[PDB]
Amino acid sequence: IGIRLTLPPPKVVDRWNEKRAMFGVYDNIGILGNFEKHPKELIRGPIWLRGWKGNELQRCIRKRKMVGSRMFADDLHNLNKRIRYLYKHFNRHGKFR
Amino acid sequence: PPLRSRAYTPPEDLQSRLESYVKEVFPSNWQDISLEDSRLKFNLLAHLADDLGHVVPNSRLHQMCRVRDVLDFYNVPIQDRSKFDELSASNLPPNLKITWS
Amino acid sequence: ARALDLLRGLPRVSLANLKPNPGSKKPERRPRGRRRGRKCGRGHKGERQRGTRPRLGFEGGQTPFYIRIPKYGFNEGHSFRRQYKPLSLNRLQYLIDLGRVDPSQPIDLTQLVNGRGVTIQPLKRDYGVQLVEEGADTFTAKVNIEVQLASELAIAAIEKNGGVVTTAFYDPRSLDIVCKPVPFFLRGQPIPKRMLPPEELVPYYTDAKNRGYLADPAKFPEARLELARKYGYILPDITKDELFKMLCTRKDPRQIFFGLAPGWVVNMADKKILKPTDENLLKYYTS
Amino acid sequence: VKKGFRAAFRFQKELERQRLLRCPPPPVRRSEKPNWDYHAEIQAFGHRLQENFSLDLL
Amino acid sequence: TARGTPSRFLASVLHNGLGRYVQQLQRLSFSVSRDGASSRGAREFVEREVIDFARRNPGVVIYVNSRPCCVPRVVAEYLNGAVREESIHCKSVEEISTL
Amino acid sequence: EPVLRKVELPVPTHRRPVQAWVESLRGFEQERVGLADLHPDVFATAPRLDILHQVAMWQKNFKRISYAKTKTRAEVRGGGRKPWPQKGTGRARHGSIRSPLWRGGGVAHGPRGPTSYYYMLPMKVRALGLKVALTVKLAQDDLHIMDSLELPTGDPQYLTELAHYRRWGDSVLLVDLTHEEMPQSIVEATSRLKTFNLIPAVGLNVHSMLKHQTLVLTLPTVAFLEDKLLWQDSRYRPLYPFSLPYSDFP
Ligand SMILES: [Mg+2]
Ligand SMILES: [Mg+2]
Ligand SMILES: [Mg+2]
Ligand SMILES: [Mg+2]
Ligand SMILES: [Mg+2]
């Protein structure tokens, strides 16, 4: 048996808190603001991902370049190993040549 | 504060009442007067809605080119009965029972 | 309209109603089930399936196709063979008519680009524009065009209508400045001075047959009359034109913009132009 | 705890179904369960048999 | 499967067609939510199909109520005591009429 | 005293403008204060709901970083040695106690690192979406116009009652011109309420419009919107970012 018996507590979502009521506001700051700013300049998050996209290999390479010299030793060694593996995989393994 | 009802009953003498208001603002063949001017369109529609308790919706103010169209719009009624009371008003057969509240 | 009337009697539009346009969001494929995944499409056992088949272009040991065919310099030097974006007379007429370029003002590269008539890429070894003979017929415009090359037919097409065409040169560093000036005026560097052609090109820009900007401005009439005599029209006397003062105007070598002298600094914030006064700086720039 | 609600509610409904086979409720008048109005029922009883019963006598 | 399933013999309620045919269904309860998205076909059926069905079958008492609040359903009761429920949630008006 | 308003930018010669009432918040029954004209290509575009979908989905996803990481088979602690030799015993071959197979191992294919989902639609598509949203919220008797968002007193009860009086809806999105010029009364009132949201015109977006039922623009706002959205059709292809100076672009 892998199914619960009593009902879960009700997850109450407040669809009108501040974060949801104001979602998206200023996502047209460029078109409606004389192009002073750009939408990407509102993306809050990692230093090395604000307004950029890519597969895991490119993401790891970018992380190494921009914060590789600030990383803890073991995390950085893991990152280098990961880049090595992904290089081998994306460049030698796969259905399509 | 006392909310107004959407129900509208187009008066029988409407075609006369309307003309009085036209005389207040604007000749024969008045049905074809153009309303490209906006000052007079506003005056007319404001008077009509202050009288009949019915403002045209914003979605139907560019469909009113000529006063003929104002008359046409005011010749269609609006029902303030939700499905609640339109279901239980069609002389239901005796063997169908609806419950609402 | 019609559809806008339909929307009135439908429910309110909200994030509960949206939809993708049919045919756009193709469905996904995952290896689950008796069809998608039992071998998930990878085939029988073999290095195909494991994802270990040789590199793209390995023909199984037989000498590959791209190695048994000898080398030849189809591309040797390609990074240094200069390139020029054509500007057909058809396109020049089209731009003139719709008011994009202004024939009552000297047409340099800057005014071809500011009207989005051609797209110059300095960084890909484009040096400038070349007029091409296409559309010599039907070209009727009085333009003072400064380009970087010209077939003799284009020279004709521009002369026959009382126009002056002159072939200038722009080095890769100044071409970027002339093509997209406002960026340069933002960098803050003082306006550099145009370099002279390379060794291989001076015989081109010092020949009257090509309306070169360094050939002597006294052999030009002979060239113009020769061209007219070959192409069967009468060289109009431009000296009497209502606006010949404009068709005369030219940029001297070592100048990028028309009314700006190398060494000035453009201040766009305050609407000013700053000029030096130290004798050494003037000496360097004026040369 | 697996996160979710649909399987929990589905299992509760199935348990209720099983609990209404063992220990079925004591049967009660159809005139007490929901969805009942006597007038419509008696008139339908009439019309069902193809007979024009007088309503008061019936 | 047959072995794994009950069985019965061919039969009728009260020798139905012998004297006079009688319609076995006698009550039909519709629960239709006034708001739920799954109650859309049901709302269409009630709005433009239930009156005609009531007229065509005057031996069936049709009740309709609006208090499941999320899921519709139709419960058919018969002369011989049998009840039979059917889901009409997320179905079209054609499907509901056929059912 | 009417408060008219004509369309400034040129209208194509084959299309008449659309129109709307100009209401006031200064009183409960102050609708039809004036009549305003609205440019057809910004308030009467083709419906085009699918573009509304494109824009709302981009507006949801372009700013998402998924912070989900799962330790691969080489990032989990330990796991170096071969647990038992290959041939001798009778157990399954294994070359680590941290394969995905084993309990406590690593995910073979799991969420790797913080993932960005950013992408940008052509600017024209997003402006077109804005126009589509405005026209849909007009065609369905939901868009309004106000001379100003002024109010008699900042008490929120007044604003919510007024919204009740006119069938506005559950939620209202009020739009004013500049963040500094919204009047004191409206900002004070709309701080407490929950489904009433006050934004300056520079923040108008598709998702925040499709969320709220009613959209209430000031008149200066509609002027601003017509200017900034008509600028997209009939502009050259860029020569460099519009943040850099141009001859005609403020
Ligand atoms: Mg996949
Ligand atoms: Mg060999
Ligand atoms: Mg290890
Ligand atoms: Mg191993
Ligand atoms: Mg683990």
Coordinates of C-alpha atoms in Angstrom, one line a residue, chain F residues 26-184:
Chain F
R26 CA -15.5 62.4 -7.8
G27 CA -19.1 61.1 -7.5
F28 CA -21.0 57.8 -7.6
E29 CA -23.2 58.8 -10.5
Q30 CA -20.6 60.8 -12.5
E31 CA -20.3 58.5 -15.5
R32 CA -20.7 60.2 -19.0
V33 CA -18.8 63.3 -18.0
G34 CA -17.3 63.6 -21.5
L35 CA -16.6 61.8 -24.7
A36 CA -13.2 60.7 -25.8
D37 CA -11.8 59.5 -29.1
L38 CA -9.4 56.6 -29.4
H39 CA -7.1 55.7 -32.2
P40 CA -8.4 52.7 -34.2
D41 CA -5.2 50.8 -34.5
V42 CA -4.6 50.8 -30.7
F43 CA -8.2 50.2 -29.5
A44 CA -9.8 48.4 -32.5
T45 CA -7.1 46.0 -33.7
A46 CA -7.9 42.5 -34.9
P47 CA -8.8 40.4 -31.8
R48 CA -5.9 38.0 -32.1
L49 CA -6.1 36.1 -28.8
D50 CA -3.3 33.8 -29.7
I51 CA -0.9 36.7 -29.6
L52 CA -2.2 37.5 -26.2
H53 CA -1.3 34.0 -25.3
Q54 CA 2.2 34.3 -26.7
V55 CA 2.8 37.5 -24.8
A56 CA 1.4 36.3 -21.4
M57 CA 3.4 33.1 -21.6
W58 CA 6.6 35.1 -22.4
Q59 CA 5.7 37.4 -19.5
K60 CA 5.5 34.5 -17.2
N61 CA 8.6 32.6 -18.3
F62 CA 11.2 35.1 -19.3
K63 CA 12.1 36.0 -15.7
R64 CA 12.2 32.5 -14.3
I65 CA 15.3 30.9 -12.7
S66 CA 14.6 27.4 -11.5
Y67 CA 16.8 26.9 -8.4
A68 CA 16.6 23.1 -8.4
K69 CA 19.8 21.0 -8.2
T70 CA 20.2 17.3 -7.7
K71 CA 23.5 15.7 -7.0
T72 CA 24.6 13.6 -9.9
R73 CA 26.4 10.2 -9.4
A74 CA 29.8 12.0 -9.0
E75 CA 28.7 14.7 -6.6
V76 CA 27.4 12.5 -3.8
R77 CA 29.6 11.8 -0.8
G78 CA 31.9 8.8 -1.0
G79 CA 31.4 6.2 -3.6
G80 CA 34.9 5.6 -4.8
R81 CA 35.6 1.9 -4.2
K82 CA 34.3 -1.2 -5.9
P83 CA 32.0 -2.7 -3.3
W84 CA 32.7 -6.4 -4.2
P85 CA 34.7 -8.1 -6.9
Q86 CA 33.1 -8.8 -10.2
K87 CA 33.3 -12.6 -10.5
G88 CA 33.6 -14.2 -7.0
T89 CA 30.3 -13.6 -5.2
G90 CA 26.8 -14.3 -6.4
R91 CA 25.6 -10.7 -6.3
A92 CA 24.9 -8.2 -9.1
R93 CA 27.9 -6.4 -10.6
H94 CA 28.4 -3.0 -9.1
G95 CA 31.2 -0.4 -9.4
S96 CA 29.9 2.0 -6.8
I97 CA 27.5 2.4 -3.9
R98 CA 26.3 5.6 -5.4
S99 CA 25.0 4.7 -8.8
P100 CA 21.4 5.8 -9.6
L101 CA 20.4 2.2 -9.0
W102 CA 21.4 2.1 -5.4
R103 CA 19.5 3.7 -2.5
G104 CA 21.1 7.0 -1.5
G105 CA 22.7 7.4 -4.9
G106 CA 22.4 10.2 -7.4
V107 CA 19.7 11.1 -9.9
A108 CA 20.6 9.9 -13.4
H109 CA 18.7 12.8 -15.0
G110 CA 17.6 15.5 -12.6
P111 CA 17.3 19.2 -12.3
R112 CA 20.9 20.5 -12.9
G113 CA 22.0 23.8 -11.5
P114 CA 20.0 27.0 -11.5
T115 CA 18.4 27.0 -14.9
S116 CA 17.4 30.2 -16.8
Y117 CA 14.4 30.2 -19.1
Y118 CA 14.9 33.7 -20.6
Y119 CA 14.0 34.6 -24.2
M120 CA 12.7 37.8 -25.8
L121 CA 10.0 38.1 -28.4
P122 CA 10.3 40.6 -31.2
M123 CA 9.4 44.0 -29.7
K124 CA 6.7 44.5 -32.3
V125 CA 4.9 41.3 -31.1
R126 CA 4.8 42.6 -27.5
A127 CA 3.5 46.0 -28.5
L128 CA 0.9 44.2 -30.7
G129 CA -0.1 42.2 -27.6
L130 CA -0.6 45.4 -25.7
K131 CA -2.9 46.7 -28.4
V132 CA -4.8 43.5 -28.5
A133 CA -5.4 43.5 -24.8
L134 CA -6.6 47.1 -24.8
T135 CA -9.0 46.4 -27.6
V136 CA -10.4 43.2 -26.0
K137 CA -10.9 45.0 -22.8
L138 CA -12.8 47.7 -24.7
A139 CA -14.9 45.4 -27.0
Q140 CA -16.2 43.6 -23.9
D141 CA -17.5 46.6 -22.0
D142 CA -14.6 46.5 -19.5
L143 CA -12.3 49.4 -20.4
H144 CA -13.1 52.8 -19.0
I145 CA -11.6 56.3 -19.1
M146 CA -11.3 58.9 -16.3
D147 CA -10.4 62.5 -16.5
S148 CA -8.3 61.9 -13.4
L149 CA -8.1 59.4 -10.6
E150 CA -9.0 62.1 -8.1
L151 CA -11.3 61.2 -5.2
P152 CA -13.2 63.1 -2.5
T153 CA -11.6 61.3 0.5
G154 CA -9.0 58.5 0.7
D155 CA -11.4 56.1 2.6
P156 CA -11.2 52.8 0.7
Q157 CA -14.8 52.0 1.5
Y158 CA -15.8 54.8 -0.9
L159 CA -13.7 53.4 -3.8
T160 CA -14.9 49.8 -3.4
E161 CA -18.5 51.0 -3.1
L162 CA -18.2 53.0 -6.2
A163 CA -16.7 50.1 -8.0
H164 CA -19.7 48.1 -6.9
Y165 CA -22.2 50.7 -8.1
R166 CA -21.1 50.5 -11.8
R167 CA -20.7 46.7 -12.3
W168 CA -16.9 47.2 -12.6
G169 CA -16.1 43.8 -11.3
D170 CA -14.1 42.0 -8.6
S171 CA -10.8 43.7 -9.4
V172 CA -9.8 47.1 -10.9
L173 CA -6.4 48.1 -12.5
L174 CA -6.1 51.8 -12.3
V175 CA -3.4 53.4 -14.6
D176 CA -2.0 56.9 -14.3
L177 CA 0.7 58.7 -16.2
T178 CA 3.7 59.2 -13.9
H179 CA 4.5 57.6 -10.5
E180 CA 5.1 61.0 -9.0
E181 CA 1.8 62.6 -10.1
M182 CA -0.8 60.2 -8.8
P183 CA -3.0 62.2 -6.5
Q184 CA -2.8 61.7 -2.7

